[PDB]
Structure 1
Amino acid sequence: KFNKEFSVAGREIITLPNLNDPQKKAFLFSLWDDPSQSANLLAEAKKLNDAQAP
Structure 2
Amino acid sequence: ADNKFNKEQQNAFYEILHLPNLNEEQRNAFIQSLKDDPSQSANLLAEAKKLNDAQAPK
Please report the TM-score for the alignment, with normalisation by the length of structure 2: 0.80
User: Aligned residue for 2:6?
Assistant: 4
Q: Which runs of 4+ in 1 moved over 6 A?
A: none
Mapped to 1, the partners of 2:18 and 2:42 lie a distance apart of 16
Q: Alignment length, in residue pairs?
A: 53
Q: Give the CA RMSD over aligned residues.
A: 1.2
Unpaired runs of 5+ in structure 1? Answer: none
Unpaired runs of 5+ in structure 2? Answer: none
Tell me which of the two structures has the higher relative contact order, counting C-alpha pairs closer than 8 angstroms and 6 or more residues apart.
1
Please report the TM-score for the alignment, with normalisation by the length of structure 1: 0.85
Given the alignment of the two structures, is residue 38 of structure 1 paired with residue 41 of structure 2, yes or no? yes
Mapped to 2, the partners of 1:46 and 1:33 lie a distance apart of 19
